[PDB]
Amino acid sequence: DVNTLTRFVMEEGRKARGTGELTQLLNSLCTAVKAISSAVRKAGIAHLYGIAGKLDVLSNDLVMNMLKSSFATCVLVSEEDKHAIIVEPEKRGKYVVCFDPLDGSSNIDCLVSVGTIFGIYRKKSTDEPSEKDALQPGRNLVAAGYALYGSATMLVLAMDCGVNCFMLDPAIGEFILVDKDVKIKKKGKIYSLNEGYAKDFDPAVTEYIQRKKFPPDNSAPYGARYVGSMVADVHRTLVYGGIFLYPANKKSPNGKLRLLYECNPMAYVMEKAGGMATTGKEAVLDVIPTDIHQRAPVILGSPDDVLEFLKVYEKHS
Amino acid sequence: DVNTLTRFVMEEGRKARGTGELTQLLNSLCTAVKAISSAVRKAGIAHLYGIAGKLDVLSNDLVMNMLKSSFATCVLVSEEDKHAIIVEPEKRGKYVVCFDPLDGSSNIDCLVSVGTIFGIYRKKSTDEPSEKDALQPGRNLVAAGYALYGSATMLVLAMDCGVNCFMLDPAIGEFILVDKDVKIKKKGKIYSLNEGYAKDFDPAVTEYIQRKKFPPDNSAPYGARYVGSMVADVHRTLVYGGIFLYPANKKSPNGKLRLLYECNPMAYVMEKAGGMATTGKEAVLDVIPTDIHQRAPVILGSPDDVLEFLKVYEKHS
Amino acid sequence: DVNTLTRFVMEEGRKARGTGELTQLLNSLCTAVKAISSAVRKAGIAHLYGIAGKLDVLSNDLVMNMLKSSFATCVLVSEEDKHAIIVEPEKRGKYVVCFDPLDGSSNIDCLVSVGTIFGIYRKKSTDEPSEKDALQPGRNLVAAGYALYGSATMLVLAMDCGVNCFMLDPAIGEFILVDKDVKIKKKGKIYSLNEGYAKDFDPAVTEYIQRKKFPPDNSAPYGARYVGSMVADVHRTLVYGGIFLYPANKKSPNGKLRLLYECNPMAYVMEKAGGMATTGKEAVLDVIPTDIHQRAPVILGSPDDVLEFLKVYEKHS
Amino acid sequence: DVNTLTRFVMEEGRKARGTGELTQLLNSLCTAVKAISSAVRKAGIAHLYGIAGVKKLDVLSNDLVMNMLKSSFATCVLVSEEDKHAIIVEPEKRGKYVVCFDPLDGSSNIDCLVSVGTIFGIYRKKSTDEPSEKDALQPGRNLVAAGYALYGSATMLVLAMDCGVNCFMLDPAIGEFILVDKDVKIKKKGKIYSLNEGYAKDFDPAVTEYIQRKKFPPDNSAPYGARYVGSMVADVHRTLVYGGIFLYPANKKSPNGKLRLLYECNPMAYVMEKAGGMATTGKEAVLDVIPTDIHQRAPVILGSPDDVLEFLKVYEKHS
Ligand SMILES: O=C(Nc1ncc(Br)s1)NS(=O)(=O)c1cc(Br)c(Cl)s1
């Protein structure tokens, strides 16, 4: 039986006997994703080039305006805005959303895969909304996921029921469910990190990657892949297994990716998919943020591969 | 003044006072790319999943049929067919086309970028058309390029007049000229290869990569990127500069990429953009093929980066 | 603030504190309508014509399948099925849907406007669902409307809250609310009927039409428009005012249009839009059907015009 | 074997050993029509309604056609329903063709989403003077090519040349015009008449009697069906596909009719004749009228020949 994203969320919402606010939020978000996808695939570019005589800015506005007008949110955190956005009172709902509206867009001149990442928290207190309502550990996530604008557009949605993958059919503007209850392989064969930074690697990372290239036993060395666009590298890791690393070094003691709207939603998808996600010293989802734009190192993927990393990591501790 | 692909090709054809066959071939090829792109982005996937109750094969069929019916071709070589296809006498024209109808499609389950690669030769001999007509060196290419199905779908077309880039506007199904007479950077800051084969690397490749991670002049190390899809990796190399390497390993002692419809067309685009493409021992375009599916090692990209590799290569004889 | 059809229905439905069955129904129906529009604008026709080497039947299948899999219906009546379809028990909901999946389709060979018409009733008894559950007067409509596949695609939805018009943005596959709580003009300037049956007209129709062409008060005569596709002629009456007639003649004492899935939903849209809808002797919504395909004569549109028709009809006892 | 418009025109051009200017022209026109269709189906309308927090359609259509023709290097004079004067292409972009067009006909009723269309006619420049408005004053007989786009339930391009009439379906999934009807011919006689009967008070007596004959046939045969969309391209295209007769005739208040000869009547008459139909003003063939003003009007009755003849017989009966 065919299933769409909207149909699916509605059916889960009725099972749970909820009020509907989250379904309205997710429906708005889904619509924002279709418009972003359309602009990313360069719909209307002929008009820009004079046939009749901003991509991350538009991305941010699409998500921002669709979430605000959903009547389901009260605080919004974005890669693009220095401060949390507080929804005006008439539109205030009960959810906090952190998002990266177009991750990887810094290299979009080469038409690399890009994506939107989002995380949804229930607002916990009844105080007047403020930036502080976004400083929750990822463990508190109600829902998280990403859309990948790759060879095709896919929406990956993680909730407590698990991880589900939806393909955008552009002929009809619908997300079709194509992977139910996805789980990552226990062990993979691919490692993903920018090896041009080798001069600066923490000694444990240097030893870990060296073992993937030169296994002590007779196993085959791992393949390397690194798109440089997080959503694409994480989705490959999810679909094929393995390990993704953007680790900490002495130049970056807290890593580079932002915890709220990059590391946590990926850590959440990974954990709902049976994988792992650590900073080296703790699970990414247990980190308690103090700044909405603070960074975190992240190592995520297949459990055996992440467990092996932590073993090399503790060897150097 | 705005320009489309078909408009651009027609204007060159009349300047060149030619018969139109290459225009018809190129026009047909362009139609195939729009169908492939439509298919790669999953238009109509909802019907396959039962809303009303293989991708590399289809791409090959679209290209074959559009070329055959162009009346402009006589021999077709495809990554997907063990033998050259001989066009029937009534449809025979004067051109030989080597193409990969969907390169990278082996990893499309993760929505990696994919692309179509093509090279167009004039038939050289006067014998009956046969497989022998495709065994020409890349130096003999009349036209070459690729369609990249990435965040957007872009067509890169290379001829003697230089390199030109056309963006597919999917709202109207037209290729829009967006980059005229492209030239690659003299020196880039990114190197690209699968470093998991390090156990098998040639000493010259090993030394070259170390100089990228640990520069002798203590200048900044290069960034690493490796998508694993040749069209995406080479296109990034063209847009941002740098160097792409797929050298030989123990599983691939003659390298892995195919000379006729992968290495030569990319080498031609690179050279027409002012860049370089070498096997280590000779220019890719100077290799005389003996087998239509034969492999080649290739190092290509910015001239300063490619020369430095060759300087290291000669150090190791 | 921007609104889509699904967001609009969710917000009304939450206001009404309902179970969600109707929203699931309306969303499924929206998905079917987007699919039909894609087929109607001939997406993919290149494949039927051999690029790689039914319409009303497909339309009926799309509606049937989205309705069956919506978990909101139990009885379906279609222009295309002699008998009502009884939803299988595990998919049963409480709603009865009567629809014409592609009316006007016999003349789609000239690319005339076509459309989907639908009316939604709540089920009657709790015994076996059966064909009798569709034999309700139009007065019982819970919701009704149509999609028009014209120069653009528009969905018109009528409920207790009023009539609203949604434009399908084909770039993103969303219905955007563009006309809130719409009302028909009190009096229009266009009459619409097939004047080729004039030899068979009821004397009242003859006198009414003569009054439009040769106005007694020397006002300007009405313009005539008749596309031959009911959804197209009816939408024009809604948008611009005027009167649409498919009257009973000497040959067809109960007219030609079908009461359940053509006349009733248009009368319902007309009444909720401030217009009128008569058979000549009674309000269309007051007719109690006895057979699911029974026909009814219909005169609908701007009230002053329909009253003017009724006044001539009453004169002819 | 599949055929697209761009492929088909290239092939015909190579058979005829032409220079390519007409093919560059038609390809440019073809692109404009895909752009109009996209806007007519309302792509991107969510942005106009604030999904992230420009012009009117007949203005945008005219700019699309104007700009593509100018950049085609194939034109020298452009006449449009929307511009009082002929546009004379700048010397650097000048070609040898004169194009008359209605960029978005029927647009007065596009608010109800009725079918609309683009109409075009292409003449060769005859004289050797510098290009001017006068180079467009040619009879329809001089047409090199003519046709229309119908933006209906699907988008179709009907293109007529000496080789005949061909119909192309736009596949919006890939943006190509697919050949779906080769060498089209109209029925000898139809069953549909098409005109605005709301003007009946003012009909010329020939129109009144002829229409009266369609509703109440003398040989107690079945009456004709009526259709009138009110959009010329939709009504004319239906006449081609199903046969029949289309009338926008002259009355005493409009002795030269309302539709424009250069960019509405002539291109439709040219298609009708190439498909085996007829097109008359009542007194002469539309294609034989010599225009004196680029925006002058003409009466037109066109369609299946047997039906047009019956009209002309009724017309002559009323002298
Ligand atoms: O959406 C609802 N209820 C509904 N009532 C009617 C319709 Br129709 S949907 N509840 S919810 O808390 O938002 C939710 C969404 C998901 Br997915 C969950 Cl799991 S729980």
Ligand SMILES: O=C(Nc1ncc(Br)s1)NS(=O)(=O)c1cc(Br)c(Cl)s1
């Ligand atoms: O295309 C033509 N001639 C034409 N005449 C009129 C039109 Br319109 S096209 N010749 S060609 O040999 O195919 C060619 C394409 C390119 Br690009 C070249 Cl350089 S040479």
Ligand SMILES: O=C(Nc1ncc(Br)s1)NS(=O)(=O)c1cc(Br)c(Cl)s1
């Ligand atoms: O839709 C709901 N409930 C919902 N709860 C949460 C979400 Br989210 S939708 N009920 S209904 O009876 O279907 C209905 C549709 C319309 Br439109 C009405 Cl007015 S009432």
Ligand SMILES: O=C(Nc1ncc(Br)s1)NS(=O)(=O)c1cc(Br)c(Cl)s1
């Ligand atoms: O276009 C050409 N020749 C060509 N040369 C190369 C290519 Br490729 S096409 N001739 S033309 O005069 O424009 C013309 C179009 C039609 Br349709 C005619 Cl009949 S004649």
